[PDB]
């Protein structure tokens, strides 16, 4: 059944506050952003594809800019995107969990990926 899943970031740090959320194929998922920093903007963006697809669209996202959530207008390999956080903002993006799987979510902002990532486990 629908649930929301909390995260934020990790204060101040270029992290999120959780580094692994689990869900069910199919299940509808809110994810609910909480940016705990006041200076940061960050993002959650659900991608497909390993640490290099994430890379390719984290580096697309330095010339895509803020009007287009730092991300490509190329949502091939993009299942979800919350909104832009702003500095102590909360965000939520909706969505039907993807296949049986392991999936990264990262942040697009410049500069906070590869550290700003984690995994997604659907069962
Ligand atoms: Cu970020």
Redesign the pocket.
């Known amino acids: 059944g629908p649930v929301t899943i909390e995260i934020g ?1 990790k204060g101040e740090e ?1 992290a999120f506050d959780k580094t692994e959320l689990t869900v069910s194929a199919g299940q509808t998922v809110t994810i609910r952003f909480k940016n705990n920093s006041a200076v ?4 959650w963006i659900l991608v497909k594809g390993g640490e290099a697809e994430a890379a390719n669209i984290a580096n697309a996202g330095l010339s895509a800019g803020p009007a287009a959530n730092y991300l490509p207008a190329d949502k091939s390999n993009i299942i979800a995107e919350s909104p832009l956080a702003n500095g102590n903002e909360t965000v939520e993006v909706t969505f039907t969990a993807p296949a049986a799987g392991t999936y990264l979510y990262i ?1 697009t ?1 410049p500069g ?1 990926y590869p550290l ?1 990532q984690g995994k997604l486990v659907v069962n």
């Open positions: 970031s270029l940061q903007q960050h993002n942040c902002v906070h700003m």
